[PDB]
């Protein structure tokens, strides 16, 4: 038995069909991620990706930022997450302006309207996830430490 074959039956394309690239587990994970999941509008793809990314962004800024030993550490960490979010949304918008011609198609990610939808959803979800992380850390003393409250 052999586990490495030509990609999509084509021996001359610049890829290989390896277990990491094309196993059932990989295909299940890739097909179910919000970027590739079927039946989702680009705005909803943006919302789910944004909620995920905004939620984890809060933590490194809060724990390791300049005001980390102050009592405004969570405030500074959230606002730093917000600043990164605003800069990244500017990056997404300028990518959309320069990469896609204007056509009526809006249900695919790689169209002008579909990218604008994804950017709108990504900003809303990102600020939402950062806000949710702020609420959770604000209220639960376990999250404020690294779990160090138990010791």
């Amino acid at each position: 038995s052999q586990f490495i074959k030509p990609y999509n039956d084509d021996p001359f394309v610049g890829n290989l069909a390896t277990p990491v690239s094309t196993s059932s587990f990989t295909k299940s994970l890739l097909s179910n991620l919000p970027a590739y999941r079927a039946g989702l509008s680009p705005l909803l793809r943006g919302v789910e990706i944004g909620l995920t990314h905004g939620y984890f962004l809060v933590g490194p800024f809060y724990k390791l930022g300049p005001l980390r030993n102050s009592d405004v550490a969570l405030l500074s960490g959230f606002f730093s997450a917000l600043g990164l979010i605003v800069i990244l949304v500017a990056c997404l918008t300028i990518y959309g302006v320069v990469s896609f011609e204007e056509t009526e198609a809006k249900d695919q990610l790689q169209t002008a309207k579909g990218w604008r939808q994804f950017t709108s959803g990504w900003l809303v979800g990102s600020v939402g996830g950062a806000s949710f992380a702020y609420i959770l850390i604000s209220n639960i003393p376990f999250l404020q430490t690294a779990g160090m409250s138990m010791l």
Binding site: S1, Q2, F3, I4, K5, Y7, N8, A17, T18, P19, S21, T22, S23, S24, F25, G147, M150, L151
Partner: protein, 104 residues
């Protein structure tokens, strides 16, 4: 357990090759084939009169009693855990090779 020994799932190790990972049999057989020899006792301060599997399982229970506190650098847990999982992974690798490849 992404695929059992019986021809039931469609899990393909790659794009078009189905391959039965024998996760129940290999995991069970490798565990028993590694744990049973490892029961051999030894009057060494790391083992304490037990085998490596039994001293390891004892150090799991001892550190779980003090549940939030982690075991210290000089604690025997880390060396028992390392050697145990090293030989366990080696026996899973060799068992998967033997069972999937030779099939008997």
């Amino acid at each position: 357990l992404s695929v059992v020994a019986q021809s039931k799932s469609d899990f393909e190790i790659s794009d078009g090759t189905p391959y039965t990972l024998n996760v129940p049999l290999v995991g069970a057989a490798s565990f028993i084939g590694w744990v049973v020899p490892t029961l051999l006792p030894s009057q060494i301060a790391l083992y304490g009169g037990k085998g490596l599997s039994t001293a390891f399982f004892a150090s799991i229970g001892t550190n779980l009693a003090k549940f939030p506190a982690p075991p210290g650098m000089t604690d025997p847990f880390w060396l028992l855990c390392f050697i145990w999982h090293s030989g366990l992974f080696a026996t899973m690798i060799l068992g998967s090779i033997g069972y999937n490849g030779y099939a008997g």
